[PDB]
Amino acid sequence: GAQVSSQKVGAHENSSTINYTTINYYKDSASNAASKQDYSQDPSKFTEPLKDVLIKTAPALN
């Protein structure tokens, strides 16, 4: 049940993909730590919530 993932390495020693290991010890998922491997999204629903979305090179009002 060990999950092995890659670390995003910042400073490098003068010594490659370094991995880390996680095992969940509890049945309830609320006990789990955060994996912090989080995806993102498009801001459009806030920055461009327009019915006809127009291209930035074209006039906004036609």
Binding site: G1, A2, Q3, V4, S5, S6, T21
Partner: peptide, 4 residues
Amino acid sequence: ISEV
């Protein structure tokens, strides 16, 4: 185990 499961590497990702």
